[PDB]
Amino acid sequence: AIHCQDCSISQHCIPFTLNDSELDQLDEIIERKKPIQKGQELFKAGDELKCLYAIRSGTIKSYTITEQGDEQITAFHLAGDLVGFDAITEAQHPSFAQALETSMVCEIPYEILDDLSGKMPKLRQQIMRLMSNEIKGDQEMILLLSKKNAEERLAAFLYNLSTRFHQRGFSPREFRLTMTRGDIGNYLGLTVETISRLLGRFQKTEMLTVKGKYITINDHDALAELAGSAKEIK
Amino acid sequence: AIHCQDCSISQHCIPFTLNDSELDQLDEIIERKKPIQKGQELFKAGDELKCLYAIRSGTIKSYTITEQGDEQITAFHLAGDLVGFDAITEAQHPSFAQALETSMVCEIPYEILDDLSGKMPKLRQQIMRLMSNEIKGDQEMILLLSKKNAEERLAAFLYNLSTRFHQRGFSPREFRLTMTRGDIGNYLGLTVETISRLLGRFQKTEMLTVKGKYITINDHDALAELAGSAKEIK
Ligand code: SF4
Ligand code: SF4
Numbered sequence A, B: 001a002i003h004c005q006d007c008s009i010s011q012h013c014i015p016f017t018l019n020d021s022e023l024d025q026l027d028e029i030i031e032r033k034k035p036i037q038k039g040q041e042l043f044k045a046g047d048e049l050k051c052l053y054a055i056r057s058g059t060i061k062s063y064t065i066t067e068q069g070d071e072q073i074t075a076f077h078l079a080g081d082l083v084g085f086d087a088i089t090e091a092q093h094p095s096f097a098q099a100l101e102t103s104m105v106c107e108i109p110y111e112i113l114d115d116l117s118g119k120m121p122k123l124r125q126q127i128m129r130l131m132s133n134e135i136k137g138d139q140e141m142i143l144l145l146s147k148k149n150a151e152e153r154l155a156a157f158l159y160n161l162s163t164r165f166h167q168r169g170f171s172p173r174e175f176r177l178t179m180t181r182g183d184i185g186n187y188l189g190l191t192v193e194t195i196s197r198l199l200g201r202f203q204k205t206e207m208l209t210v211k212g213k214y215i216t217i218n219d220h221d222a223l224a225e226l227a228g229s230a231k232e233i234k
Helices: A020-029 A110-117 A121-147 A150-167 A181-188 A192-204 A220-227 B020-029 B110-117 B121-147 B150-167 B181-188 B192-204 B220-227
Strands: A041-043 A051-057 A060-065 A071-077 A096-099 A104-109 A174-176 A208-211 A214-217 B041-043 B051-057 B060-065 B071-077 B096-099 B104-109 B174-176 B208-211 B214-217
Touching (some): A020 A121, A051 A110, A071 B121, A110 A121, A121 B071, A121 B110, A150 A174, A150 A181, A150 A214, A150 A220, B051 B110, B110 B121, B150 B174, B150 B192, B181 B192, B192 B208
Antiparallel strands (some): A041 A096, A051 A104, A174 A214
């Protein structure tokens, strides 16, 4: 069934740069269980770190719960992303991960994986780079939350999704918003009605076409202009 | 002169868990050059990744420059912190690092270090945990920027500095703000006058004493209450 040797996201997931034998060795330890249902949690905050989770297909959201019980989303993960890097420093998950649609996950036992990386230097370096890239994306999200207005925040979110789907071999132009608009506003710090009005405006300028949960980008230059700008003085 | 064997922050820096021989091996590759002056940059965005930087003493700030030329700070680094993790994924620094006071830095050549970690599993695991902890702190900063008001943001910033200085063996009670208040507001998304009024209020409740750049915490319980709360409805 599911194996890394026959995976289209291998170049963006954990087996990147591994040759055939290294790839066989890596794939042996990975486990594929029943599909993750929508709303099902991969782990809860405080759970013992057992395995990392790669996303064969679907959408995952990472979030924490404030002292007052409010959910705050910290990341959306697409196919090829690895979830659970924040759990290594203390062998315990400090966050929640929840599927937003029916999703296939690859469970990678962390201690066995780390034992393997001590024997496969390419895998070690790829793990390093993936953690570094998560750090980089978190820094970019910090800049988004600090310097971008509502228009710029939503544009950056949409451009980021477009480029990631394009990296995963999908259409760079049309893609589905698998997360609710409430979750988008939670992640960007906006209201749902603010998101709806911004989408209306984006469609009015013909930059986007919105049809249900499907987004069509018609002017990537204008979208990237709004996404790479921080023009809000405040 | 400067060696990891005679370093008080060894348990919080990179040589953690290394025995005597492993520690000798690690220390051999690390280089100590002239001290970093205030305002001097360790690297610029786009510089080739040559070495990571550990902080033997002083204060560093990481920041990026927006398309409109504005600086946005993403982190402050104290003694024992490692700077340059975001540069691994592409062997190139995506950010700037600048000293806020006279600082001593340990230059760790990254390729030699990664070659060593392929031979010393404890060091490999410690590098993993440090990157994981940077991810965790970035997630916490995202939550700060998303859910906390000005009062809560400043309280969390001050409590975080207090706990980190306490981890480094310093006073948990009194500490110096080596970064300017403008840089604090940049990092937290606040105005300098907002910061000054918040400090006035914190001093009015006797929770803090402010004297120049020195902060004295008198009620850690109240400070942690404000720091761990996200009570702003908006
Ligand atoms: S998603 Fe699963 S099968 Fe595909 S490359 Fe990643 S670990 Fe391998
Ligand atoms: S600051 Fe320098 S000397 Fe001290 S533990 Fe870190 S690398 Fe070693």
